[PDB]
Amino acid sequence: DSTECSNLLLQYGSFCTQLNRALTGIAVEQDKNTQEVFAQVKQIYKTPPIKDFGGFNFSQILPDPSKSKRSFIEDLLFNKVTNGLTVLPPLLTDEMIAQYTSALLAGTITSGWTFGAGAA
Amino acid sequence: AYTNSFTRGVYYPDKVFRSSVLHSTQDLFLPFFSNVTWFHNPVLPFNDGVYFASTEKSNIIRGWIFGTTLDSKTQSLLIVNNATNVVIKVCEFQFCNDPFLDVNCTFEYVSFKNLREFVFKNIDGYFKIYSKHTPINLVRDLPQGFSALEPLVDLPIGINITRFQTLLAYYVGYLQPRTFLLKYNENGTITDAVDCALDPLSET
Amino acid sequence: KCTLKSFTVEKGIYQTSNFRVQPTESIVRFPNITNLCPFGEVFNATRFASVYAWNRKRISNCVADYSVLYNSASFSTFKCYGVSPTKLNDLCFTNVYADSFVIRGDEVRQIAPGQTGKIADYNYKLPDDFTGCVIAWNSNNLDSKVGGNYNYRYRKPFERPLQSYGFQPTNGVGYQPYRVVVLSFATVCGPKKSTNLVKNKCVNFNFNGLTGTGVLTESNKKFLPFQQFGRDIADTTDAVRDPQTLEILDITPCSFGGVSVITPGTNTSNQVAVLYQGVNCTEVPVAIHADQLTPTWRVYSTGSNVFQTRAGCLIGAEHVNNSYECDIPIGAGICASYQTSQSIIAYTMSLGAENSVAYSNNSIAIPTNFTISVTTEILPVSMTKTSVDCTMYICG
Amino acid sequence: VYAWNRKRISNCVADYSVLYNSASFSTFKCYGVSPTKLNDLCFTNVYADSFVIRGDEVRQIAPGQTGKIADYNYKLPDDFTGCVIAWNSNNLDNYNYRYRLFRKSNLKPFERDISTEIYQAGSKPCNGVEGFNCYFPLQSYGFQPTNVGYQPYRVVVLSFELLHAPATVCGPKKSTNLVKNKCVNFNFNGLT
Amino acid sequence: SALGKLQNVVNQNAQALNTLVKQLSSNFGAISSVLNDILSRLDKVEAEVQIDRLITGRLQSLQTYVTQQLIRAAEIRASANLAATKMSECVLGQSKRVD
Amino acid sequence: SALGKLQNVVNQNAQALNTLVKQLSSNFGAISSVLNDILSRLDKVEAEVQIDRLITGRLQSLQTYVTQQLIRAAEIRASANLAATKMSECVLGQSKRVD
Ligand SMILES: *[C@@H]1O[C@H](CO)[C@@H](O[C@@H]2O[C@H](CO)[C@@H](O)[C@H](O)[C@H]2NC(C)=O)[C@H](O)[C@H]1NC(C)=O
Ligand SMILES: *[C@@H]1O[C@H](CO)[C@@H](O)[C@H](O)[C@H]1NC(C)=O
Ligand SMILES: *[C@@H]1O[C@H](CO)[C@@H](O)[C@H](O)[C@H]1NC(C)=O
Ligand SMILES: *[C@@H]1O[C@H](CO)[C@@H](O)[C@H](O)[C@H]1NC(C)=O
Ligand SMILES: *[C@@H]1O[C@H](CO)[C@@H](O)[C@H](O)[C@H]1NC(C)=O
Ligand SMILES: *[C@@H]1O[C@H](CO)[C@@H](O)[C@H](O)[C@H]1NC(C)=O
Ligand SMILES: *[C@@H]1O[C@H](CO)[C@@H](O)[C@H](O)[C@H]1NC(C)=O
Ligand SMILES: *[C@@H]1O[C@H](CO)[C@@H](O)[C@H](O)[C@H]1NC(C)=O
Ligand SMILES: *[C@@H]1O[C@H](CO)[C@@H](O)[C@H](O)[C@H]1NC(C)=O
Ligand SMILES: *[C@@H]1O[C@H](CO)[C@@H](O)[C@H](O)[C@H]1NC(C)=O
Ligand SMILES: *[C@@H]1O[C@H](CO)[C@@H](O)[C@H](O)[C@H]1NC(C)=O
């Protein structure tokens, strides 16, 4: 915010704009990547109250209201990873990502591959 | 005769609070594990700047004289502790080399069981003093451990120095341009350091 | 429209400008004024030596209150050969040399710079181009005893000619000898200004020559007694000690962030909504044109509808408790859309319909029919092939 | 220097080589153009600004310079296109040559000011009459043959206008026939 | 609106060339951005100081374009390899690879 | 050490931003890196000659950062396309593709 400097900066033209245009393309792509990966599933499936999966025990990987919706293992993973310049929020919050991983997992347990090929 | 510096002689390089951080800086520093001359007075070169220490609890060591001649002609530092105060002057007399008992001045200023340690350097026309006082057990070599010296005094006096002497157990070592990594704790004190040139691990 | 260099805008969110909270006032802090220059004693003295042997002194980095010499109109004379006494109080003497006695004879005004005469060239020296000003007090008040210059010999200022002098003891500083507090150019420097201190407001600041802008705040940071300011991991200054009362302030950068305009396409409406990225809505009604200028722009600042979101302060859109597919994205689960009598709404996006699959240990669902489905997929395969003659582009 | 005189120059052929080759001139510094090239160009207006100063002051006549002349009498704009010309004029030496010694603030580029108010460097509110460090603002050079930086020097500044406006003062170059459809080198009014 | 991927490729090439042209209007700190002004107004030694500012700015303008075209071409190649793979596996065969 | 890939994304973003901030303090051959010094210590033409070095250095530093982020983003996109493919074939199906 020096005035004399900010006048001299005009002599260079479109450089302090194609920088913002380039970074904006990167910023939008990070929201696209997150949607390409997690948003496979069209409906938010959720597991039944009963847990009679033939002896298999998914309680470590399913959601838990005592753990945000994150599973027990998702809580390990979220603990083990640790100006003129601004950092912008993602479009999807961690609670929305956790609902997609829940929906994918609950479909997979209850309905095989069929929730990808059609209705579960 | 010689003794080891170990890791003594680090000092706060600037008047700045850095906390819970490692900071890298280049200055005139005493090199780690370098040799240090020991004495029980003689006249000594000042070089680029001095580290000084002594075993003291008595004020046998009344202070220092500094200059180019350090006598008889030209403006020269006299630094003294006389128990009434620490006292400083820049005079040019042919005054006595040991004016104490049987144990021009255009600037002037006033303010064993233990060791007292000091650093003297002279940069951009300012003469700068850093210091510490501590208990000791070993007296015949510098005690192995860590302690950062802090600024006392910072005087605009512009005088040239190449030589100095003690006013009558004491030690002298010389600063060199080196890069150090300094560990500032949560309360803004330096608590550890690495001399980056010392060995391949310190460099790493 | 100017951001996109066009009079048509398609549906989207466009960053157009940067919001930046302005410094509301300027603050200065320096240590308490002390160790003033002693030479005012020479101006207040009742006598001085003659121009053949004017006494002399030197400044010792003492505080030169030179603006007080602008008030020295109690002198019988004055002279200058450079900058004004206000400029001297705004500066410092590059050389220490200072007055202690009087000029006399034809050189009588040499208590001040800009003088001329024999004594003014040496034994009461005061150059015709010495970089300052001074007052002079006559033999009737300060420059001499009752013998005047006639008792002696005459033709920095008022300090160190051989001719027998003759300037009168009773005269003003032109006809009599003259003497005063004076000097000519780190040797002696002007007094440090200061102001009162403000907290929790964006200000411009100076502390001990550390300068910047920020919201100053009280803090618990434990500086050591000799430490005057503190630094960030990236070395930026972020805390300071107030030199007049030694408490530790914490310095916060004044709020800034991108301004983004949410719009439907200009076919649908000229209505828009505005997002201040990362700002907290209480910190708007501040700074740029969007608050300052017109009803039409400050409708998107100072009222209408205002809504804090995790992405920033959003203005001119209506919050809704329903949830929908994301039309225009904002951030942190928020989206906006134009809806029906019509306005822009803002809402939390919906991931999809909720469903519980009817699972049990002995139930299966089998399809009894099918549909063939034909689906489109599109991929780019090649760019426009280009060649640039760089000599023709660069040198024409 | 306070009554510095501007003459507009227009509707002519010119020859700047006559000026540049004259032995009369002690300086001929040009800004935004080279003195050799002036005879190839054509300008939308020319203005000549002229006054007398002491010889040492000539160095202040530049864009971005500082001092009493620039502060209180005559200053060039920061992108000035033109030439500064000066010479000793000892035959003029004389106490008529007023300049301004002090001002309430520095004057603007190509500004001019007749004001005669008593300014105050001492603390007294002198209110239009002189006294202890307060003074009448126009005073004059003591031009005498006894003076080198104090000697009288005559000054001219040529200011050139390069607008989209029509060509109006041209160097001594000659026009030719307006060829069409061929690949040609061309020059219209200095647009090569 | 279905062909947004293909129309985007055309738009990016147009904006890159139009930006590369518009930088010829910029001064880069020379007395003019038009090269014949410098060559007509200034004699040889003075002119080089101005021309080297324009050479420096125009060369950095062109290096910026070529670098972003190299990155943009690699993104299109990753799409062309996928399209070639979809043609071999989907058109010339029948694929069991889900979605 | 299990999550080294995700921790490296965090570290690379922080390292890049920290370096872009530290380059504010460099001289690039100018009289100072603190802009008010150049403005206050010098006459207008000398200040403008000195400031253009800081503008050049900071502008070159910022183009260096954005180019590095463009290349780093293409690497992350190539991994997001692999994760979208893994989810489609492995979670929503049963892939016969070895390893
Ligand atoms: C599913 O497995 C979990 C552990 O993976 C079982 O829960 C743990 O059971 C032991 C013994 O009762 C306890 O010490 C742990 O504290 C339990 N953990 C939690 C989080 O409760 C769970 O009981 C198993 N359920 C079924 C139906 O097999
Ligand atoms: C330096 O230190 C070594 C031991 O590290 C010692 O043997 C040697 O005598 C010392 N030399 C000098 C010149 O102090
Ligand atoms: C000791 O210092 C004080 C001032 O601190 C001084 O008055 C006194 O004369 C000094 N005495 C000697 C013997 O140095
Ligand atoms: C001042 O300088 C002279 C030599 O010029 C020297 O003899 C004298 O001792 C000095 N005075 C003081 C107070 O140091
Ligand atoms: C101080 O020493 C330098 C050389 O190191 C010399 O140029 C200078 O003249 C000396 N000044 C005095 C006052 O001795
Ligand atoms: C740091 O300061 C706190 C008080 O602020 C004190 O309680 C603590 O003991 C100090 N710790 C160290 C290591 O200095
Ligand atoms: C506006 O409407 C026209 C048809 O009336 C259409 O061709 C054009 O693409 C629309 N523009 C936008 C920005 O949607
Ligand atoms: C500054 O002076 C005031 C009294 O004028 C006093 O209250 C304050 O404590 C002083 N501060 C310092 C650091 O001396
Ligand atoms: C800043 O936002 C938070 C909620 O995100 C709120 O508690 C706080 O009061 C806001 N600050 C101001 C000054 O309104
Ligand atoms: C929206 O929900 C909030 C609580 O989240 C409630 O206070 C408010 O009245 C609701 N508004 C409408 C229009 O239903
Ligand atoms: C199967 O679906 C088609 C429409 O897709 C319908 O015409 C046909 O009658 C259906 N057959 C049965 C047996 O449901």
Side-chain angles (χ1 to χ4, degrees), chain C residues 73 80 82 85 92 98 105 112-114 117 120 127:
Chain C
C80 296
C92 186

Side-chain angles (χ1 to χ4, degrees), chain B residues 73 91 93 104-105:
Chain B
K73 184 178 180 182
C91 310
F93 300 113
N104 277 234
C105 316

Side-chain angles (χ1 to χ4, degrees), chain B residues 86 109 118 128-133 150-154:
Chain B
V86 175
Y109 176 85
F118 300 89
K128 298 176 188 284
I129 310 180
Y130 314 79
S131 76
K132 213 76 184 190
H133 317 328
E150 72 194 66
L152 295 186
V153 156
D154 184 8

Side-chain angles (χ1 to χ4, degrees), chain E:
Chain E
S1 62
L3 276 72
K5 295 182 183 181
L6 304 181
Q7 185 59 66
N8 163 64
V9 170
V10 182
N11 295 354
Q12 289 195 29
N13 304 334
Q15 290 187 5
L17 288 167
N18 293 348
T19 302
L20 188 66
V21 174
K22 286 173 188 181
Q23 282 290 57
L24 295 178
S25 71
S26 300
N27 301 67
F28 303 109
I31 61 98
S32 173
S33 61
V34 177
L35 184 53
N36 295 312
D37 295 354
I38 297 169
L39 294 168
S40 57
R41 288 168 59 159
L42 300 176
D43 215 329
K44 296 178 182 178
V45 180
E46 306 96 289
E48 291 182 344
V49 180
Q50 304 302 321
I51 300 161
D52 198 36
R53 294 180 189 167
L54 297 185
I55 290 172
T56 302
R58 289 177 183 190
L59 181 53
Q60 181 172 5
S61 173
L62 186 57
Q63 283 183 346
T64 299
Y65 166 83
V66 177
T67 303
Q68 293 184 2
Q69 292 293 74
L70 285 166
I71 297 162
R72 186 177 285 128
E75 179 181 354
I76 298 302
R77 189 200 302 158
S79 183
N81 289 342
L82 179 58
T85 303
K86 297 231 174 185
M87 201 159 307
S88 307
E89 298 183 21
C90 314
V91 182
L92 272 67
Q94 181 186 18
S95 192
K96 290 195 173 185
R97 296 177 64 207
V98 174
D99 300 352

Side-chain angles (χ1 to χ4, degrees), chain C residues 194-217 219-246 248-309 311-324 326-334:
Chain C
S194 282
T195 69
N196 203 4
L197 180 70
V198 178
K199 296 177 182 175
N200 302 292
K201 199 183 188 77
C202 178
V203 296
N204 174 43
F205 64 75
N206 186 334
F207 290 87
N208 296 354
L210 301 163
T211 52
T213 67
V215 177
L216 304 177
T217 65
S219 83
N220 69 298
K221 292 182 185 292
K222 300 301 186 178
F223 287 15
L224 306 181
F226 68 91
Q227 293 170 340
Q228 305 308 315
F229 64 100
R231 288 183 184 277
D232 190 18
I233 306 300
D235 300 330
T236 307
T237 304
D238 71 1
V240 291
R241 186 182 294 277
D242 166 17
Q244 299 202 346
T245 289
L246 308 188
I248 307 309
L249 309 180
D250 169 3
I251 304 183
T252 290
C254 301
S255 300
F256 73 91
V259 178
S260 286
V261 182
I262 288 75
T263 188
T266 48
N267 286 358
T268 301
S269 184
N270 301 317
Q271 186 166 351
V272 298
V274 182
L275 172 66
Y276 295 87
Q277 293 145 234
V279 182
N280 190 332
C281 290
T282 309
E283 307 180 4
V284 199
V286 167
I288 69 161
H289 308 71
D291 189 50
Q292 301 287 1
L293 171 61
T294 73
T296 180
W297 213 341
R298 99 171 66 95
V299 146
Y300 312 110
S301 175
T302 341
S304 322
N305 193 63
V306 176
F307 170 40
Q308 186 63 40
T309 76
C313 185
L314 177 63
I315 306 188
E318 293 186 88
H319 175 255
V320 167
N321 285 359
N322 305 338
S323 55
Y324 307 90
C326 190
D327 184 12
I328 304 171
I330 284 178
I334 305 301

